[PDB]
Amino acid sequence: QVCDVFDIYAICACCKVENEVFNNYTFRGLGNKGVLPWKCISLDMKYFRAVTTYVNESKYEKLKYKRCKYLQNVVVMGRTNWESIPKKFKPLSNRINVILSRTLKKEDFDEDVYIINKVEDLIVLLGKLNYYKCFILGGSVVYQEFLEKKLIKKIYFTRINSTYECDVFFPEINENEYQIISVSDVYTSNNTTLDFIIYKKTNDDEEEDDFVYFNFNKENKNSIHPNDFQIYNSLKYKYHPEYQYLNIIYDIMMNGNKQSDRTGVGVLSKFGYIMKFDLSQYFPLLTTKKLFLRGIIEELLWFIRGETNGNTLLNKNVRIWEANGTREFLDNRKLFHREVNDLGPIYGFQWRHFGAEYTNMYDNYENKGVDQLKNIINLIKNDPTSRRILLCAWNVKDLDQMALPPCHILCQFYVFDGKLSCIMYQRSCDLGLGVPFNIASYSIFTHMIAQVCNLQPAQFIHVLGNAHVYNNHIDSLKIQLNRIPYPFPTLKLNPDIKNIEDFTISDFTIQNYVHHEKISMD
Amino acid sequence: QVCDVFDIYAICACCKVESNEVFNNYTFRGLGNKGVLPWKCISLDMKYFRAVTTYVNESKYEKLKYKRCKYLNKKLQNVVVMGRTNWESIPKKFKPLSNRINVILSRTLKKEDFDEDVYIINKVEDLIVLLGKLNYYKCFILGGSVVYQEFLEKKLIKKIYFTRINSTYECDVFFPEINENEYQIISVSDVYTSNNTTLDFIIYKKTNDDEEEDDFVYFNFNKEKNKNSIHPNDFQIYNSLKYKYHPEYQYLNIIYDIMMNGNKQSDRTGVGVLSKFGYIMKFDLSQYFPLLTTKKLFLRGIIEELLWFIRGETNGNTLLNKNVRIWEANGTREFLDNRKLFHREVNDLGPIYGFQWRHFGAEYTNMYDNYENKGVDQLKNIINLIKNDPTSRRILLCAWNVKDLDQMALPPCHILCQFYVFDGKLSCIMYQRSCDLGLGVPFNIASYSIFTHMIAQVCNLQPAQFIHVLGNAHVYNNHIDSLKIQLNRIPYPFPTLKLNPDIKNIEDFTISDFTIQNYVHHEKISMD
Numbered sequence A: 001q002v003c004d005v006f007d008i009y010a011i012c013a014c015c016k017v018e019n020e021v022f023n024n025y026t027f028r029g030l031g032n033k034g035v036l037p038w039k040c041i042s043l044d045m046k047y048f049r050a051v052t053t054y055v056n057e058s059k060y061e062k063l064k065y066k067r068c069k070y071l072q073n074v075v076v077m078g079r080t081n082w083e084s085i086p087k088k089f090k091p092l093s094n095r096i097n098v099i100l101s102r103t104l105k106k107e108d109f110d111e112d113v114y115i116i117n118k119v120e121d122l123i124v125l126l127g128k129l130n131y132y133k134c135f136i137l138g139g140s141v142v143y144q145e146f147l148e149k150k151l152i153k154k155i156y157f158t159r160i161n162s163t164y165e166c167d168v169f170f171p172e173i174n175e176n177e178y179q180i181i182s183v184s185d186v187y188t189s190n191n192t193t194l195d196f197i198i199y200k201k202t203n204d205d206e207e208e209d210d211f212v213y214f215n216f217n218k219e220n221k222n223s224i225h226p227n228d229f230q231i232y233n234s235l236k237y238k239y240h241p242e243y244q245y246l247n248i249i250y251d252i253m254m255n256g257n258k259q260s261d262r263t264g265v266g267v268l269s270k271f272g273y274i275m276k277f278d279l280s281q282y283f284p285l286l287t288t289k290k291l292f293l294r295g296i297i298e299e300l301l302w303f304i305r306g307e308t309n310g311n312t313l314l315n316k317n318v319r320i321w322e323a324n325g326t327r328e329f330l331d332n333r334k335l336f337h338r339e340v341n342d343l344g345p346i347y348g349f350q351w352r353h354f355g356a357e358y359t360n361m362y363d364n365y366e367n368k369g370v371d372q373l374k375n376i377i378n379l380i381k382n383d384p385t386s387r388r389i390l391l392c393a394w395n396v397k398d399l400d401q402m403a404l405p406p407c408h409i410l411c412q413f414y415v416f417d418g419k420l421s422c423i424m425y426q427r428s429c430d431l432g433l434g435v436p437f438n439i440a441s442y443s444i445f446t447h448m449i450a451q452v453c454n455l456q457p458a459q460f461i462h463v464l465g466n467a468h469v470y471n472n473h474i475d476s477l478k479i480q481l482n483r484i485p486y487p488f489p490t491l492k493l494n495p496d497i498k499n500i501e502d503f504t505i506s507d508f509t510i511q512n513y514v515h516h517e518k519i520s521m522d
Numbered sequence B: 001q002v003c004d005v006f007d008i009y010a011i012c013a014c015c016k017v018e019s020n021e022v023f024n025n026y027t028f029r030g031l032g033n034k035g036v037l038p039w040k041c042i043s044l045d046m047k048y049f050r051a052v053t054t055y056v057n058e059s060k061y062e063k064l065k066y067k068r069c070k071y072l073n074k075k076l077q078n079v080v081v082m083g084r085t086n087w088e089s090i091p092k093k094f095k096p097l098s099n100r101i102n103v104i105l106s107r108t109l110k111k112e113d114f115d116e117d118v119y120i121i122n123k124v125e126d127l128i129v130l131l132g133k134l135n136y137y138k139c140f141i142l143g144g145s146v147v148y149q150e151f152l153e154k155k156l157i158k159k160i161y162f163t164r165i166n167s168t169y170e171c172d173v174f175f176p177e178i179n180e181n182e183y184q185i186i187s188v189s190d191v192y193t194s195n196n197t198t199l200d201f202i203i204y205k206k207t208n209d210d211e212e213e214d215d216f217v218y219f220n221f222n223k224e225k226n227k228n229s230i231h232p233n234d235f236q237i238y239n240s241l242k243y244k245y246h247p248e249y250q251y252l253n254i255i256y257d258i259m260m261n262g263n264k265q266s267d268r269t270g271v272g273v274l275s276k277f278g279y280i281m282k283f284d285l286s287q288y289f290p291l292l293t294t295k296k297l298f299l300r301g302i303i304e305e306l307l308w309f310i311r312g313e314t315n316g317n318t319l320l321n322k323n324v325r326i327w328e329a330n331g332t333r334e335f336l337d338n339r340k341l342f343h344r345e346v347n348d349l350g351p352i353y354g355f356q357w358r359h360f361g362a363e364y365t366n367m368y369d370n371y372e373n374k375g376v377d378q379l380k381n382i383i384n385l386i387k388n389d390p391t392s393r394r395i396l397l398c399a400w401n402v403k404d405l406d407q408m409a410l411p412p413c414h415i416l417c418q419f420y421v422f423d424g425k426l427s428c429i430m431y432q433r434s435c436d437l438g439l440g441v442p443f444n445i446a447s448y449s450i451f452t453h454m455i456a457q458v459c460n461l462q463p464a465q466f467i468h469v470l471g472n473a474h475v476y477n478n479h480i481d482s483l484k485i486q487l488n489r490i491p492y493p494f495p496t497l498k499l500n501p502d503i504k505n506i507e508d509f510t511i512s513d514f515t516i517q518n519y520v521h522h523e524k525i526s527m528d
């Protein structure tokens, strides 16, 4: 077939167009009033250059022998495509420029800028040329025709995670026809998140042996099947940061230790992982399922206030600590003399009054115990190279007084070149229900500390101790692993807020959260 | 020449031989004894030996057929060549060597004196002709000391697949001293345990759908002007190695990442460091004791410090009486005064590790006080949780008592240990807030690895993984030159730690209960 012989790839960038279900079709905005919808997105413009111009001559011979039996790249436009280009660069910095037009003759441009009559008249032009691969730069109509006539092999699709006004749309790529094989890292250019995905059309080596020898010792470990991680295992490149979470699910499903827990439900457990997310480039809110952030933002505001009063949350319908405050739960904890929803000296108490004698959840503790939250802020502002900037919730003395010991042991902060990174160490991690919320919680926290100290957020680093998947979560997580992440949203904090204690729920906005549908983890 | 055409490799296994000791690669030279191998079974070596000498790649032969047929002007199996003593050492049940074309060098023996499917040759020359007239993938020289010596001398070996057996045995025959101009190490395996010995595998080399490979180049359009440009020529050896699979490269490779990508900061003193934030190292304590080999470390001091922790001691005088100076400088009048501890006796280090491990929450008085049944005995508690509730996810030991930080001589570097139990095996995560890669971390790895052994043993479990999480990971700028020397040293197989096994209680350990066996190490380095 033609499209493997000649190497015809599309290359596009689609934004979003003016509750809401998402799918790949979400991204389709191509152009507007003859120009791109967006002002300038220089990373995608840079990606464009690299992909279209790149050449590898050592693999061209293998192309030259197959192509005949039937150096630079070919780039195909349409008139309104060729036109919209600002003058001062045409032809495009050393590529074989080419235009599909009806009312343009090849006379009135160069002899390098080969015009074509119809679509069928391009196969003519290639068999007579010396080029690497063929990139359809597109236009609405150009893409429509080249796709309709199964001419396109791979599709270099840039997903622009922001909404714009559009007069022209990329066609609904048929997912039984084509399918995503690679997803890139997520990036911020020009005040939008984006990523780079790849649709394919469906069907010394001294040291290569040395590799096999070194593997001479390697070991259905768990009852988890091959055919079920199909989409997941059928991607080549999985560089989207959400794969850091998803790959831990995979590792624990594939290689996890079978274990009883206190409940009895059954878990697969491993011990010791890292996740790093770049807060300067995205907000890591998992996209492979709907997540809600009001509760966990209220939880955080509750911590910062020093509250241990489970009821302040329940009245706002944030039920994160409901189970941990019942008579039945406190009694099983031997807390027979503790009022319902008095969670004892937990996070907020420890952050504001570590070392103070806990009484009940209504006492006045002003200026009692160590106000660690205040202390790490001053340190961040006054001593940013300090290696002593820890917020520790694990107070050994008070563990037995807490409804439960802190799942999140400590935050350590690091400062370089006006930038703040944070490590949270988590002793116990429910990968299915908990961890996705936990990533969002401390990322927001990392932003909040960043802002009130006049620093840019850099890296949130999540260290998992006991990392477990509930046996009764495995079906749901199987559905989830075979979803492909969307580009992440962004967090906008109200910039007026300059002390850690002044954030209200209103001061938090999530933007461009494009997500798969909800999953009952049960 | 002749070695590249015919792919003539050597494979051997060498132990240390009967002899304030210095170590080079000539340390590992012992090949056999009284006609046989110096050791009974080392199964993991024997299995490696079989995988390498029987592995062929069907698809790769075609190009080797071409290459070899070109030079002569013209199931798949490997050839294996052995001296007559070598051949006679093999038991009947395993002769001839399975799934391989056996060749034997001999003058005293001819075909008539063998029942078995084997080629006999009396000349090295005759082998090269034999190889010319045969279909094989790779030709491996199984040795005998004499066979090894002459195939080397004749510049015939492309690569030596070399097992370092990190134990000592009576030996009568030795591998030839390899000329380091002739052969350079290009690969070093993971370290392992088999039949009560560590070993690794190193490869010496001689000197003098391709559509989705393009997709890689694309997904890198946005990479590096790489921060601190320190010079290539400096890390020549470190960067030459193709496979760096020795667990010591986990430490070494962090030194490199900090040197090449580290952030420049001036610190607590007004000195100078390079820093990054957030690393993890994993060390399989069932397989080796990860005491670093690219320089000398003594453990006496750090074992004394750990026994001093477990006792709940805060008294620096106890360590100085044992001539352990690890805490001396944090105990001086000058230092306690600069930490505002004006009312603190010299060498009274206040409520640090030991105090927090046995008495967390008790009011610190002075280092002489009897704190019995005051504060939470964390160490006792976690020893009980590991014994009675092994799946508990709360087996943390914590030194970072927020309330007492200002009363300590300095806050703890080593913040906490979380424990994990599966199938009678104990693993340990240790979170380090502040890590001097240069002096501190080598010792810190040694301390918590010994601790995992101690807890594991007194709880009737087997040590599994020690996991080391680094927060602020930094290199002092005056350590840089010393660390360059170190990164160009090739690790040796790790030693082993023996705990006196009669110790059933965490408090009952003493110095003499600790034996490091087979520490093979490079030369002492002053980071200063």
Ligand SMILES: NC(=O)C1=CN([C@@H]2O[C@H](COP(=O)(O)OP(=O)(O)OC[C@H]3O[C@@H](n4cnc5c(N)ncnc54)[C@H](OP(=O)(O)O)[C@@H]3O)[C@@H](O)[C@H]2O)C=CC1
Pocket (backbone or CB within 6 Å): A011, A012, A013, A014, A029, A030, A031, A032, A033, A034, A035, A036, A077, A078, A079, A080, A081, A082, A084, A100, A101, A102, A103, A104, A117, A118, A119, A137, A138, A139, A140, A141, A142, A143, A145, A168
């Ligand atoms: N999002 C993205 O990735 C990209 C978007 N754009 C945007 O695309 C928009 C323009 O695209 P859309 O309106 O389709 O414009 P096109 O670039 O598809 O141009 C259409 C013209 O191409 C010619 N043509 C198309 N098909 C044929 C054919 N089958 N035979 C002969 N000639 C043919 C005709 O030229 P004639 O006028 O001679 O009839 C036709 O009018 C602009 O807003 C531009 O900014 C451009 C590139 C990429």
Ligand SMILES: NC(=O)C1=CN([C@@H]2O[C@H](COP(=O)(O)OP(=O)(O)OC[C@H]3O[C@@H](n4cnc5c(N)ncnc54)[C@H](OP(=O)(O)O)[C@@H]3O)[C@@H](O)[C@H]2O)C=CC1
Pocket (backbone or CB within 6 Å): B011, B012, B013, B014, B030, B031, B032, B033, B034, B035, B036, B037, B082, B083, B084, B085, B086, B087, B089, B105, B106, B107, B108, B109, B121, B122, B123, B124, B142, B143, B144, B145, B146, B147, B148, B150, B173
């Ligand atoms: N640790 C390890 O990796 C290895 C250890 N070994 C051990 O080493 C010892 C055996 O080795 P070592 O005694 O050197 O003896 P070899 O196995 O090298 O035997 C040498 C004999 O083979 C013949 N031979 C060698 N070269 C030639 C030649 N060029 N032309 C004709 N014949 C030749 C001669 O046999 P003839 O006497 O018949 O003339 C010679 O006496 C054993 O203990 C064995 O277990 C062996 C291999 C590997």
Ligand SMILES: CC1(C)N=C(N)N=C(N)N1OCC(=O)Nc1ccc(Cl)cc1
Pocket (backbone or CB within 6 Å): A011, A012, A013, A036, A044, A045, A047, A048, A077, A081, A082, A084, A085, A086, A136, A137, A138, A158
């Ligand atoms: C569609 C293409 C090829 N791919 C990506 N990812 N982004 C685009 N903007 N591309 O448009 C085709 C084209 O002709 N682009 C173009 C627009 C403006 C200038 Cl200045 C140069 C090329």
Ligand SMILES: CC1(C)N=C(N)N=C(N)N1OCC(=O)Nc1ccc(Cl)cc1
Pocket (backbone or CB within 6 Å): B011, B012, B013, B037, B045, B046, B049, B082, B086, B087, B089, B090, B091, B094, B142, B143, B163
């Ligand atoms: C030298 C060699 C091949 N390499 C390693 N790494 N370990 C060894 N023991 N080898 O021995 C050569 C040899 O003659 N081996 C041999 C093979 C089978 C038996 Cl049963 C006994 C010895």
